[PDB]
Every structure is written in C-alpha cells, then in structure tokens.
Amino acid sequence: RILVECLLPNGMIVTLECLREATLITIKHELFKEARKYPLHQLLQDESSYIFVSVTQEAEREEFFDETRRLCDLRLFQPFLKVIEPVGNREEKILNREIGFAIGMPVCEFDMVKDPEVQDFRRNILNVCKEAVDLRDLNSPHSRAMYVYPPNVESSPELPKHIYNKLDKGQIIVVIWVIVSPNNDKQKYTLKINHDCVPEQVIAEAIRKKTQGKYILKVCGCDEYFLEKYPLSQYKYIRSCIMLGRMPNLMLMAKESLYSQLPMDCFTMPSYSRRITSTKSLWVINSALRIKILCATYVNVNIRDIDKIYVRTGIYHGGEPLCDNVNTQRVPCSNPRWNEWLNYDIYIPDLPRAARLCLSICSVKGRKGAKEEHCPLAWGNINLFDYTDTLVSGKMALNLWPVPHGLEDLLNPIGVTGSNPNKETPCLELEFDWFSSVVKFPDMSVIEEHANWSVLRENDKEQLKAISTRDPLSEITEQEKDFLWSHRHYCVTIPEILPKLLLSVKWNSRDEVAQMYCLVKDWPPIKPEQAMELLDCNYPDPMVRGFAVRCLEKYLTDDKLSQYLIQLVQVLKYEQYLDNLLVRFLLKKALTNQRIGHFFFWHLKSEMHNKTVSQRFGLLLESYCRACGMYLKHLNRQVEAMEKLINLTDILKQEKKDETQKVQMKFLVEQMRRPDFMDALQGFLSPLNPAHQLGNLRLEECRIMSSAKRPLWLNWENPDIMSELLFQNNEIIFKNGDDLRQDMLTLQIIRIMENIWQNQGLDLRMLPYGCLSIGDCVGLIEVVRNSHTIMQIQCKGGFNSHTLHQWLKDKNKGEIYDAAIDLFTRSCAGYCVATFILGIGDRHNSNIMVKDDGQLFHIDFGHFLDHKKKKFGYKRERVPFVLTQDFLIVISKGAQECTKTREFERFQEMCYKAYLAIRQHANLFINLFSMMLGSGMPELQSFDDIAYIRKTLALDKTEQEALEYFMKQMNDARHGG
Amino acid sequence: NNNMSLQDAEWYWGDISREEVNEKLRDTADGTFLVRDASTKMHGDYTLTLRKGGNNKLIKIFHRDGKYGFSDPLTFSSVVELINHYRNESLAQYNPKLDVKLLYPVSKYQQDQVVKEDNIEAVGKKLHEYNTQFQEKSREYDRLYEEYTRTSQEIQMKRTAIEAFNETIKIFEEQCQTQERYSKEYIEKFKREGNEKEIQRIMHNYDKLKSRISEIIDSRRRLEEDLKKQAAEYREIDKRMNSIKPDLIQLRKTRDQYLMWLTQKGVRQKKLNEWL
C-alpha cells in the first residue's frame, strides 16, 4: 500500500506498489516480473547477484544484504530502491547495521572522521576486544556460561553477626523444585543444609533426598544460575531470603539443557582493523608559554548592549590554574579581531603532562560607574599535549561551546576538551609558538633520572594521621601542604594519605612532579574506595590515574564494580584522551560479564544525546557491540522496544496533551493493539534487570498514570515456567519528560547506606527500587507491588492522625502486629536520616508510600541537596525532619503521648546510631558525589554543592558536637510538627 | 595606635563559610585578602585567605598562650598587629615561595555601603520591587532558553535531512549516467530500424527519470531555505539571551545584598520572605 520506485541496473525506473510489511525478498522477487515489460529487460539477470539500496533517515547509503528485513524496519527516507550487484563482505555489512541500530548512529560515521586519534582508538581497542573474547572461550562451554549468567554473589563470605542469628545453628531451609515429569509436573523437596555449602553439595544432597555433577541450580522464576563454587549463603538471592525470612526456592536443571541455549559467538576483526623526525624533549626548550589569539569567526552579541569583548585564557591543570590568567585587549563588539601574543609565566619545561588551555569569549558591559559586568559568551579547552605525548604547535581553529547555563564563572576548566562538532558556532583561531621541531613530553626514563639528581624519625605521626583521616573536601592550609610535602617520604606508612599528598605538590614545577612520580611508582596499594577518588577531576596526571586503575583491577570485585558503575562511567569524561587505562579496564570487564555489560551499555547509551561526549561514547559503544557477542541481538530488541514507547508517549504529549484521559486511554489501547507495536513490546529482557524477561503484554492492565507527567503503566506476564513462586508479573513505569539521573544517584546512595547499616548491626531496611534512565529525560521505574502512598491510605480509609495506624493494623492483625510496627520503625528511621543527610525536600503525603507488611519507603526524589534553596535564595541551608503525627502514632503503637513513649526512645537512639554510622563513612559519600560533577545534573555542578553534605554530616565539627548537632535537628522538627 | 579591635577591622569578615570567601575573591588581583573565623568554629584561629597565582591560598593564624603568628614562634599580640605587619612586609620572610604583600583588603564596609535606604519600611518595598523584576527576568530567560534549545533540535534535524537529500540526488544522477551510456545507443540505437520502442519506451522512461531528479533537487532547495531562515533565527535568540543574562546577574547580586544587610542584619524577621 506504499508506492515505490526501483532503479534497475539497465538505467530504467519502475513504479511498484508494496506492502508496508513486505520483506525485501518478496519485493525483489515481485519487482522483476514487472521489469520484463520494459524496453531493456533483456540485460536483466536473475534475482541473485542483485541487492537493494536506499537512504535511511540517518542519511546513510546503506545496502541491504540481509533481505529478510521488511519495509517498516527499513526507515527509508523516501520510497525508492536501487538494485546493484552485492559488493563486499555480506556478513560484515549485516553486523554493521546491527551495531548502528543499537548505538543510534551509523557506523559509517566513524569511518569519515579524519582525526588520527579517533582512528587509532578504533583499531587499537580491538586488542582488548580480542583478549576478552578469547578469555570467555578459555574453557567451553563452561567459561561461556559464566559470561552469560555470571554468579550474582556478594563480596563478603562471612554473614553479618546479626543475620547469622536468623539461622538455627546456621541451617538454611531451601526448597528444591525438580521438573522431570514429561507432562510439566513439578516436584518440590525441602532441604536443611549449612549456609556455607557450595551449590554442588546442595545438588549432591538434593538427589539423595529424591533418591561433572550433570546439574545446576537455577533461581525459580528469574533465571539466575548458581554456577561458581561459592558458599550458598553468599549468593545475593539466598542472602536476601534470609533477611526477609522468606523461603528460598530453587530448581534443578541439567547442564545440557542450559549449554544448548548458549549460542556460539564469533568475533571477527572488522575491516578497518586490517586497514593500516627531529624531536626535542620538553625540558630542553627554554621559553615561556605564549599563545597568539588571531580572531573569532563570529560571536552572537548585540552592539547596543555589549560594549566590548575579549578572550580570557588560563593554563589549568585539573581545575587549578598553573599561573595567572591572561586577557586580550577589549575590542569592539562589531569587529572581533585581536592578533595578540598572550604571554604566560609558566616556563615551558615546567608544563605538566596533563596541562590544558581554558579560554572564553567574555563581554564587558560596564556603562555604569566603575562596575564592570562580565558575562562569558563561549568557552573551550584544548590539551597542550597530543595523545602521543606531543606539544601542540602551529596554527589551530577551535569551535566554542555554549556556556553551561547556570554557570556564572568566566572559564570552564571542567568542560570537555576538543572543538565543537557543530560548525555554525563561534570559531576562535589560535596559533601556538613553533619551536623549530616537534616537542615531546619526556619519557619516564628521563623523568625518573631527573628526580634522582634533585633528591630521620619523627614524633608528629599524629598530624599525618589527623590529615589522612580528614574529609576529601576539608580545608587544607598552606602550612599543612608544606608539612605534607616535607614529609612525603614518610607518607607511605599511611597509604590512604596519597590523595592529600598529591594536592600539596605544585604541579607547575618539574622538580616537584618528577619526585612525585618516583614516589607514586611504589605506593602501597590502596582500598578501591579510596582509589576511586583519584579518578575525579582533581587528579588529571596520567601516572596518578594509572595507579588508581591498578588498584581498581586487583581489588574491585564484580559486585562492587556493579554498584559503582554510574560513577565510573562519568569519570570517563574527565579522561583527556580516548585511549586510556580506565576505558581498557572497564571494557575488559563489560566483555567478560553480561550483567556489567548490560548496564555498561545502557549508561553510555543514555548519554548519546549529549554532543560533548557523543563521539567518545559512540566509539566505545561500537567497540563493545562489536565483541559483546550474542547479546547484541538482545540489546537491539530492547532498544527497538523502548523506541516504540518513546514515539507513542510523544504522540500523547505534543498531539494529545489536552483531550480527556478516557480519550487518551482509548487512543492508547488502540495504539498498543496494532501488531507492529505489539510484536516489538514482547519477548525481550527487561532493561532494569536482564535476569527478568518480559512475556506477553497485558493490554487490560497497562494504563496511563494520572501523575504530573502522565507516565505509562505496563504489565508483562513472566514467561518462566515457575513464575508463580516468584512474582508473576512485571509492572514498569515508563517516564518520558522528567530527568531520572538524580533518582539513580539518590537510589544508589540509599542502597549504599543500607549496606553500611546492616554491617553495623542496625537492620534499617531501605527499599531502593529500580530506576534506569535510558535516554534524554526518559527512563524506566520499577514498581513495588502491594504498596500505597500515604495519601492513598488516608483517602481510602477516610483524616485523623490515626488513619495510617488503623490501616497498618488491619493489614496484619495478631501476633504479627508486633513485627509490622518494628518494620515501620526500622524503615521510617532509616529514611528520616537519609532524607536529612542528603537534603531531600518536598517529602509529602504523595511521595511517601508504605507496604502492607509495614515497611515504608520514599519515591519521586528528583531534586536533592537544596537546589530549591539555591534558585530562590533562602539564606542559610538545611531542611527539617518529616516525622509527622501519623508516623509517631504508628511508631509508639498508637499511644496518645507519642513524644516520650518508651519505644520512641529506642527510635531516637537508632536514628542516632544511623546518623553516626553514615558519618564515619562520609569519605565514601563525598567521593561518590564528586565523581558526578561533570554529569551535568543541574543540582550538582561544583564543589560548592557537595559542600552541603559537609554541613548535614557536620564534618567540620567533632563527633560529640555532630551528634549533639543532630539531636537539635530531631527535637526541633519533632515538636515542630 | 594602629592596633585597633579586630571586630572593627574592615577586612576581618567575621564568620563566613569557605564558599562565601570564594565568590568575594573571584578573579581578583594577586594580594587580595580577608580574614575570618576558622571553620572549626573554635574561636582563636582566624584563617587568612590570600589570593595569589590565581589561587586562593588559605593560611592559618595560631593563638597559643594569648599570642599570634603563622609559625611556632608566635610574636604578635593580635591579628590586627599581624595583618598590619604583612600589609607592608612581603610574605617571603614567612615563606620564600609566597612573595606577596597584603595589598587589597576586601573591606566589609566598602561593599556594604553599596546598599542604601537602611529604613526597613523602604527596604520592604525596595526588596519586593527587585524580586518581582528578578522573577520576571528568570521567567523570561527560561522562555528563551527552552526555545533556543528547542530550535537547536530543529536545526539539527533539518541539517541531516539535507544530507539525505544529497544522497538521493547523487544516487539518481548516477543512474541517469548508466542509462544513457548503456541503453541510449548500444541497444536501441543499433535497433533503430523503425521500431517505436525507443520513441515510447526509452523516451518515456528517461523523461520520467528527469522529472524525478529535478523534483528532488527542488525539494532540497526549499529545505535549504528553511534552514537558512532558521539558522538566522537561531543566532538571533542567542543575542537576546547573551544580553538578558548579564543583566539578570546584577539583579541577583543586588537583591541578595539588601537581604544580607537590611532584611536580616538590620531587622531579623521571619517576615523576610513575606516581603516577597
């Protein structure tokens, strides 16, 4: 039902009618019988030796070797098809289309890029892809199995003492379901086994009760497999069941019935892989860094409003100037030409390897007294050293970036380097002094020798300890820095002091740095939590960032690496070059563990709309999708699935943002009913959790939530055979319009908090549900079943402050009633401390919702810290507690005198313990926030914002003062509400 | 005679967070300085913030046994004595690598005098007037930004659609080349023996091809017109925001300055936010 035109190879044109779902084969076959009735049909050949071709919406000259595709999937720009002789590697071309569809941009684009760094990365990374792909295949089919279904274990074999007490003598009652009856008949056994038994013993003991091993244990319902030889209590599923006291269900499956599903995956080195004097060391040059500013191609400023403009430059080294900034004379707005040799005081031999050049175009307003009003118009940094250790020289042109709105500063040392890919933006021509040859940064061989040329117990070990234990953002005074550096040789004995000892080094003097290099080369290894701090924007040196990764590789466990994935993705943007040790580490991990890979991909993919990092992430995504293996087909199915949602959601915003909800719901049901959409939204793994797989969509349950953005409620039947044991449905909110990056960080922090509390001994049960941002202001939210918002309960139970208590008592009445109230208290305590430390505000009766077993959890975080106090300045910061009459009534079992009930005091005491517990681990929470500075979250742009945490935790004060400071907060809000 | 009270000193700023010191010492000449209470809040420390080399060097003042100094041999009787001494003596004596003098103190009065009409009644009206302007400006600024960002998307989509038009035009042109080379003379012309196939078949096909190529070429030109008009409008929105933004910055400073020195210090009120 679509008119198309086919350009036969005999210089003919044929008009033809096609079915929008018609495949290429049917159309190619149908076409030729039409060609016989045209003047030059004799030169035609058979169907074979011919393939179609067209232009896609992405404007790609793509030849469709894989004829099985149909018209709708084609995404043709216009309905025209050309027929030519297939040329090239058919299998290679088919893969390239698969990769391009997943990463959202044609792979041919990276072929066009002429930058030698981009091309070297494309072919140099591949040796990483090969090693991972070979490693997964070291021991088949076993090794290939762990990659696809990696053990979901925890890093600590030994149970917390508080949870070891939930096992009678450490015995676990595990139910085992064996499904061997041909008529899908399920058998269940009950086992009592030690917590430390390896899964094979569980299998070994399981058979005897029924009366290598040939069998593997699967989690009944969600397809997670117990493959590796770990204590059965270490697996996250088994550990969780203990905590919740539920009965753990497992099923026995034959290894053959699993190895069969694992399809052999071949990684072929792509085509581009096969495709393809006088040097002066930096230290020999003797001069001062001088840079010439020639002209600016065009600036978008108004002559009447702006008096003059100038270019402001500085030699930054990871956020701190290496010397005084410099300015260019103020030239008139209408004519932006300078041609001036800006001159800096940084001697060339003293330029640090990670030195940069931050510059901007600022407009001077003045025009009133002597109050200059400066407002930058553009910015852009450039590394002074080539990715090959070469100092830029000769002329250059740079396209500047729009100023990050909300940034009042006149330079952006934290922004990404390189030109603006767009060409219709202010271009500033530079010109770097030419030193008669190529200047390379000295190699480590010379640097170490230089340090040796220029190079006693102490009683003040307390001062070193005192500093080393301080906050990452704590004030560091000049006397201390001089103290730290003077005692650098004795700082090894406190290895976690390195982050402080690095700041005390003056990076603008090659005698200092050469000595810090000879010292970092022997630093005792450090905990991965501390090494992650050496990767944010404050530490740009390659040898410092190289040390941090070596710590990550040999101490970061796959569980922790999964928890800190969002942060580790962000600190990729702080890498000045495309080929760095961190990316090789991260990719090596993503290619040996599909769980990491799934979130590695989705984190990069969600940030492809951002042109600052679109290129470097796009190249990374390509290298991954090339070697991910058979997973690429699963990812493509997810990607195609989300796109149908985005398009459908958009139609309900720009087209149906006014009519009634019933019309919207009726319109939505029709749109879901169409088979084209119907097949895309079924039978794919859930992006939130790959281990869950979504079956048939339930049209009767999917509905348009009536919230602010009107998100989308989707119900998927679990296709697993033993779905009944675990949840029998997946319900997911698809949100298009609200940024979800804050919630991911908020929910990631809550999960980290609860982990710390558990280890301490406080069973404060948080509920950090699943949230994932897939694209730009679009994401997925997991739904927690059998839970209601406080507003729903009051409205449903309608008023009185006891309405919440009455509802909670009814849901579980009897001896259990004690268990509920305890869970309400433990949960409510955890969230009061968490919503205060992070300054989450606006908490009301619609983003506080409570399960039926009494547990309470917060939803709809969005803004954190006090962004709402930054915009509309409210002088002093901080927020009060939300403990309301309702929560107090429930906590004290409905006693009329809520404030000083006996059980209330245990509530306050456990709030204190929680507050102190997080405070002792404030280093970690500071590093997590700092690594997210460049993410572009409006609430988190500078160390000014992270300083808010340093208040709520009262980091500056002492432990006693902090606790007493906290108690003041609780009392104030307690009787204040 | 020159050792007055630290409280009445014009550079000692009292209790201010490390953050507050930073905005005041922003883009200032080497030698800008000020003094404030230590972050620990244990009175008797008085950290010194000195701007040198584009950095905010942060020096500490020790107060053992009722004396003061930077190093252990405390040899000063008060901060004002210490600050005054280094307002004419270079710090190189203290540190060889800190060759500066305390040149441009950040006077608390010098900037505080910027605000006027200390009477609270006038401040309440004056503050409300600035807030209404500031809120209107921010509302107006946001309107342009969303349009500016939204118009950026339309430009990018339009630009790519042009490239797709380039490919389609290029593809068709190559076919016209092959058709004329192959079927124009080799087959039909050699078959020029009274057959009407060339007259009807070949000619009808070729003309249909030409009308198709031209039509595509025409659509590309019409698209380029929209891009050109959109690109110019895209630049114009940039100018409006580039002028609105600097103005909006000044209002923020002024509104805050009144609140700091009139609505909070002069008269502490919970009514502060009621004026707005």
Ligand SMILES: Cc1nc(NC(=O)N2CCC[C@H]2C(N)=O)sc1-c1ccnc(C(C)(C)C(F)(F)F)c1
């Ligand atoms: C975790 C979760 N669970 C919900 N609903 C149920 O759990 N149930 C359980 C039964 C039916 C339904 C109910 N409220 O009776 S909503 C929800 C959630 C999580 C995060 N943000 C939101 C909103 C409202 C801000 C958004 F984004 F959806 F608009 C909702």
